[PDB]
Design a protein around this ligand. Structure first.
Ligand SMILES: Cc1cc2nc3c(=O)[nH]c(=O)nc-3n(C[C@H](O)[C@H](O)[C@H](O)COP(=O)(O)OP(=O)(O)OC[C@H]3O[C@@H](n4cnc5c(N)ncnc54)[C@H](O)[C@@H]3O)c2cc1C
Ligand SMILES: [Cl-]
Length: 365
């Protein structure tokens, strides 16, 4: 009856804990957040049949779980290509929490250190000064995982800056733009600089800026201290030369609503020697850019690892090793494909590359 500790009550950590519980296996989730909705989580996720949806199915949440047009543009506004499972992130977290016993999540416990024990297992050190011991440790603590360092010294590599703005109540307040975006999404591809817009089912349009810059670029802009007029002017300067129709999205956005982050990823094919009493899942195991659909993979990781523990109830080393063999292979395949997509879609000549792809395919007609 090993004491299993799961650091991180995110998508993967909760999926693991819920699936272990459904197999009769107790585990404790240690989560830095003060409560179940301490951190706002806006937007929607598309869950895939083989991953996100499979997890909800195995968790017993299939019932509970229940136009996506896409336009790709160039900076002049020309449509390069045209194409014609959704769940709110907050609602998904509620669904996952409903399958984890309430008393098995320790809120407000932020892992700051791990000390290996001679007899096996680990001592978990927390910011509040307390500790907890376990026999099995699962790192489910996200992109900046603290547990990851027990398995590998591999670090996330910086890829890009990502800025997120909003248009609230677009149908009433910005009807032209609402009609221009429509019910799906659009992405305009420039020179190491992309502009995206995605309509949500709550009446809002999310506007994004992605640009190939160094890790300190977001901080250097000082958006959080700037007057909104200056933020808009700087963004127009960033998009100099673009079609004024496209860049009017900037002026339509809710004043004061800009969140900036860095997009990063562990190197493709990252893996490690399997250890007998500790492992990783989700972003901790294999952080990828958003195109890697890491929410889906973290949920899949969680239920596959639980199945492995239940398949080897007398040997957690065998469970961890079986889980990792499959997880290493899946992460390598998806990581390589995500890296091709991320580097082709954000490039000095991104629009040209996309057009060339279809021009080439015509020759095979
Ligand atoms: C901009 C953006 C868009 C994305 N879009 C999509 C999409 O459309 N589809 C998709 O499938 N994926 C998407 N992803 C990826 C997805 O958000 C992540 O891959 C996913 O959340 C990984 O889940 P996780 O459980 O591994 O980590 P997380 O969900 O980040 O959970 C980690 C948890 O650990 C906690 N924690 C962290 N450190 C500690 C500590 N020291 N002690 C205790 N607790 C700690 C955190 O508070 C958190 O609760 C997107 C990601 C980004 C950045
Ligand atoms: Cl309008």
């Amino acid at each position: 009856a090993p004491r299993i500790a799961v650091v991180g009550g995110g998508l993967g950590g909760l999926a693991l804990a819920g699936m272990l519980h459904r197999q009769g296996i107790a585990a404790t989730v240690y989560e830095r957040d003060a409560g179940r909705a301490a951190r706002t989580q806006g937007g929607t996720l598309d869950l895939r049949p083989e991953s996100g949806q499979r997890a909800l199915d195995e968790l017993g949440l299939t019932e509970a779980f229940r136009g996506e047009e896409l336009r790709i543009l160039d900076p002049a506004g020309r449509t390069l290509v045209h194409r014609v499972p959704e769940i709110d992130r907050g609602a998904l977290r509620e669904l996952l929490l409903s399958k984890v016993p309430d008393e098995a999540v320790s809120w407000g416990r932020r892992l700051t250190g791990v000390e290996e024990l001679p007899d096996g297992g680990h001592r978990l050190e927390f910011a509040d000064g307390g500790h907890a011991d376990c026999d099995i440790l699962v790192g489910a603590d996200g992109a900046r995982s603290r547990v990851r360092l027990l398995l590998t010294d591999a670090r996330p590599v910086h890829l890009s800056a990502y800025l997120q703005l909003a248009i609230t109540d677009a149908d009433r307040r910005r009807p032209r733009i609402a009609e221009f975006v429509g019910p799906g999404s659009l992405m305009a591809l420039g020179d190491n600089l992309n502009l995206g817009a995605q309509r949500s089912g709550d009446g809002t349009i999310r506007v994004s800026v992605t640009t190939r810059v160094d890790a300190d670029w977001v901080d250097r802009q000082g958006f959080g201290d700037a007057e909104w007029g200056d933020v808009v002017a700087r963004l127009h300067e960033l998009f100099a030369g673009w079609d004024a129709g496209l860049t009017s999205l900037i002026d339509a956005c809710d004043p004061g609503s800009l969140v900036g982050r860095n997009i990063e990823a562990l190197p493709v094919g990252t893996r490690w020697p399997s250890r007998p009493d500790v492992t990783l899942l989700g972003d901790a195991a294999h952080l990828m850019p958003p195109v890697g659909e890491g929410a889906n993979q973290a949920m899949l990781d969680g239920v596959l690892l639980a199945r492995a523990f239940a398949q080897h109830r007398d040997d957690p080393a065998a469970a961890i090793a079986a889980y990792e063999t499959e997880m290493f292979d899946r992460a390598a395949v998806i990581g390589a494909k995500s890296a091709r997509i991320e580097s082709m879609g954000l490039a000095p000549d991104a629009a040209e590359r996309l057009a060339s792809y279809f021009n080439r395919m015509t020759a095979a007609s």
